[PDB]
Design an enzyme around this catalytic site. Structure first.
Site, mmCIF file in Angstrom:
data_model
loop_
_atom_site.group_PDB
_atom_site.id
_atom_site.type_symbol
_atom_site.label_atom_id
_atom_site.label_comp_id
_atom_site.label_asym_id
_atom_site.label_seq_id
_atom_site.Cartn_x
_atom_site.Cartn_y
_atom_site.Cartn_z
ATOM 1 N NE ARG A 9 2.262 -1.075 4.257
ATOM 2 C CZ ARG A 9 2.693 -0.399 3.202
ATOM 3 N NH1 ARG A 9 2.072 -0.495 2.025
ATOM 4 N NH2 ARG A 9 3.764 0.370 3.343
ATOM 5 N NE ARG A 10 -6.882 -2.971 0.787
ATOM 6 C CZ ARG A 10 -7.189 -3.061 -0.502
ATOM 7 N NH1 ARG A 10 -7.067 -4.222 -1.129
ATOM 8 N NH2 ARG A 10 -7.627 -1.995 -1.159
ATOM 9 C CD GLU A 39 -19.446 5.646 -3.312
ATOM 10 O OE1 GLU A 39 -19.871 6.407 -4.210
ATOM 11 O OE2 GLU A 39 -20.152 5.248 -2.370
ATOM 12 C CD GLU A 82 -3.720 5.684 2.350
ATOM 13 O OE1 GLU A 82 -3.295 5.045 3.338
ATOM 14 O OE2 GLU A 82 -4.706 5.312 1.679
HETATM 15 C C1 LIG Z 1 -4.685 0.242 -5.602
HETATM 16 C C2 LIG Z 1 -5.669 -0.280 -4.556
HETATM 17 C C3 LIG Z 1 -5.420 0.436 -3.223
HETATM 18 C C4 LIG Z 1 -6.399 1.216 -2.653
HETATM 19 C C5 LIG Z 1 -6.146 1.866 -1.426
HETATM 20 N N1 LIG Z 1 -4.981 1.726 -0.831
HETATM 21 C C6 LIG Z 1 -4.756 2.389 0.400
HETATM 22 O O1 LIG Z 1 -3.197 2.105 0.919
HETATM 23 C C7 LIG Z 1 -3.272 1.353 1.962
HETATM 24 C C8 LIG Z 1 -3.147 -0.148 1.548
HETATM 25 O O2 LIG Z 1 -1.769 -0.426 1.255
HETATM 26 P P1 LIG Z 1 -1.325 -2.026 0.889
HETATM 27 O O3 LIG Z 1 -1.535 -2.897 2.106
HETATM 28 O O4 LIG Z 1 0.128 -2.068 0.484
HETATM 29 O O5 LIG Z 1 -2.253 -2.586 -0.352
HETATM 30 P P2 LIG Z 1 -1.727 -2.686 -1.924
HETATM 31 O O6 LIG Z 1 -0.736 -3.825 -2.052
HETATM 32 O O7 LIG Z 1 -1.059 -1.391 -2.313
HETATM 33 O O8 LIG Z 1 -3.001 -2.960 -2.910
HETATM 34 C C9 LIG Z 1 -3.188 -4.242 -3.406
HETATM 35 C C10 LIG Z 1 -4.620 -4.324 -4.030
HETATM 36 O O9 LIG Z 1 -4.810 -3.345 -4.811
HETATM 37 C C11 LIG Z 1 -5.434 -3.912 -6.176
HETATM 38 N N2 LIG Z 1 -4.478 -3.737 -7.276
HETATM 39 C C12 LIG Z 1 -3.301 -4.417 -7.426
HETATM 40 N N3 LIG Z 1 -2.700 -3.994 -8.539
HETATM 41 C C13 LIG Z 1 -3.486 -3.023 -9.134
HETATM 42 C C14 LIG Z 1 -4.618 -2.869 -8.317
HETATM 43 N N4 LIG Z 1 -5.590 -1.961 -8.659
HETATM 44 C C15 LIG Z 1 -5.457 -1.219 -9.776
HETATM 45 N N5 LIG Z 1 -4.357 -1.342 -10.607
HETATM 46 C C16 LIG Z 1 -4.041 -0.684 -11.779
HETATM 47 C C17 LIG Z 1 -2.799 -1.198 -12.211
HETATM 48 N N6 LIG Z 1 -2.419 -2.124 -11.309
HETATM 49 C C18 LIG Z 1 -3.380 -2.203 -10.333
HETATM 50 C C19 LIG Z 1 -5.681 -5.181 -5.996
HETATM 51 O O10 LIG Z 1 -7.119 -5.370 -5.554
HETATM 52 C C20 LIG Z 1 -4.744 -5.596 -4.914
HETATM 53 O O11 LIG Z 1 -5.269 -6.653 -4.177
HETATM 54 C C21 LIG Z 1 -4.720 1.643 2.571
HETATM 55 O O12 LIG Z 1 -4.679 2.703 3.377
HETATM 56 C C22 LIG Z 1 -5.590 1.919 1.328
HETATM 57 O O13 LIG Z 1 -6.639 2.920 1.624
HETATM 58 C C23 LIG Z 1 -4.010 0.982 -1.349
HETATM 59 C C24 LIG Z 1 -4.187 0.315 -2.552
HETATM 60 N N7 LIG Z 1 -7.044 -0.016 -5.002
HETATM 61 C C25 LIG Z 1 -7.329 1.137 -5.968
HETATM 62 C C26 LIG Z 1 -8.160 -0.868 -4.512
HETATM 63 O O14 LIG Z 1 -7.939 -1.764 -3.761
HETATM 64 N N8 LIG Z 1 -9.556 -0.601 -4.961
HETATM 65 C C27 LIG Z 1 -10.666 -1.454 -4.471
HETATM 66 C C28 LIG Z 1 -11.206 -0.914 -3.081
HETATM 67 F F1 LIG Z 1 -11.864 0.269 -3.273
HETATM 68 F F2 LIG Z 1 -12.074 -1.837 -2.536
HETATM 69 F F3 LIG Z 1 -10.139 -0.714 -2.214
#
Ligand SMILES: C[C@@H](c1cc[n+]([C@@H]2O[C@H](COP(=O)(O)OP(=O)(O)OC[C@H]3O[C@@H](n4cnc5c4ncn4ccnc54)[C@H](O)[C@@H]3O)[C@@H](O)[C@H]2O)cc1)N(C)C(=O)NCC(F)(F)F
Ligand SMILES: C[C@@H](c1cc[n+]([C@@H]2O[C@H](COP(=O)(O)OP(=O)(O)OC[C@H]3O[C@@H](n4cnc5c4ncn4ccnc54)[C@H](O)[C@@H]3O)[C@@H](O)[C@H]2O)cc1)N(C)C(=O)NCC(F)(F)F
Lengths: 140, 140
Positions: A9-10, A39, A82
């Site tokens: 969890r972030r 990526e 996951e």
């Molecule tokens: C979706 C997100 C992601 C990735 C991986 N996980 C895995 O799940 C667990 C974490 O869970 P959690 O703690 O809940 O986090 P979450 O609350 O879900 O994400 C919030 C963050 O996500 C971005 N976001 C918010 N809205 C949107 C969106 N992006 C695309 N959109 C399209 C329409 N709407 C949105 C914002 O940056 C926000 O800050 C871990 O295992 C993770 O590997 C979860 C989520 N993602 C692709 C990312 O970050 N890419 C950059 C990186 F490569 F650097 F990571």
């Protein structure tokens, strides 16, 4: 192909997940964590494929880390997603316990309740080296 | 004597403090952190000596990390005591900003308001390797 997938969890587990990555790489494991190894392309396909590729699934159970899974019947939550993938693939699941309170399984969606059946490792701030050595012993 | 002393809060900064220690050790620095390097004897003396002995003083500013310092006019709080020793000894103070809100100096005891005059480094979860390289650049 990474040897280890770290799911976390972030907002409560980002620092511990990063610490686990540095230690496991030091001991020769290839580690996936989202902010460094996800990526280009559609992230839903890529995230699921990265779970499937890794033999080990390390799950960071910080306080309340499964809360957003509760009532997530449509499987929108990413930690939920996951975990379901790791269970369905029969991965070596290794939970890391950092102040987590154990819930009753029935507050969790049916398709991930079996995550509570895997033996977890207690994170010790005082005995971190010994915690890391145990985690490495659990890894395949 | 360690080259780096790490001052932090158990409740909000333990994981970041531990992550910083490993990274800095990987780069050849000797690091003090209480749960691993504070050994036997009167801890008031030993803690202060370790701040006096370390050229660099890394201060982990997690959310609310100075709250217990406000109103601590008899200087009983340990982060308060560590900061005053570092300031009195002219150490290379390096604050690490992790979600920290900057207070106004008038809410802090006089003997530590000067800590707010040192340049800090923002911690970036997404760009952790760049953050660490910058920290090493600040160190002596
Ligand atoms: C979706 C997100 C992601 C990735 C991986 N996980 C895995 O799940 C667990 C974490 O869970 P959690 O703690 O809940 O986090 P979450 O609350 O879900 O994400 C919030 C963050 O996500 C971005 N976001 C918010 N809205 C949107 C969106 N992006 C695309 N959109 C399209 C329409 N709407 C949105 C914002 O940056 C926000 O800050 C871990 O295992 C993770 O590997 C979860 C989520 N993602 C692709 C990312 O970050 N890419 C950059 C990186 F490569 F650097 F990571
Ligand atoms: C006092 C404590 C200590 C050390 C270093 N610091 C530095 O200050 C910052 C952290 O600040 P903070 O997060 O606020 O900490 P604190 O709110 O005081 O509590 C933390 C723990 O202290 C225990 N505790 C609570 N009361 C008492 C007591 N122990 C002995 N007593 C005798 C009479 N009364 C007590 C509790 O078990 C609590 O869990 C960092 O930089 C630190 O280097 C601060 C405090 N200590 C000696 C210790 O841990 N020794 C084991 C170690 F070597 F592994 F560390």
């Amino acid at each position: 192909t990474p040897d280890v997938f770290i799911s976390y969890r972030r907002n409560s587990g980002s620092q511990l997940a990063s610490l686990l990555k540095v230690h496991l790489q030091l001991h020769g494991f290839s580690v996936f964590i989202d902010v460094e190894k996800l990526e280009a392309g559609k992230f839903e396909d890529k995230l699921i494929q990265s779970v499937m590729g890794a033999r080990n699934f390390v799950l960071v159970l910080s306080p309340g880390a499964l809360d957003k899974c509760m009532q997530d019947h449509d499987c929108k939550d990413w930690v939920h997603k996951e975990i379901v993938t790791a269970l369905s693939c029969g991965k070596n699941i290794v939970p890391i316990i950092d102040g987590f309170e154990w819930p009753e399984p029935q507050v969790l969606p049916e398709d991930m309740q079996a995550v509570l059946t895997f033996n977890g490792i207690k994170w010790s701030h005082e005995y971190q080296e010994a915690t890391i050595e145990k985690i490495i012993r659990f890894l395949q």
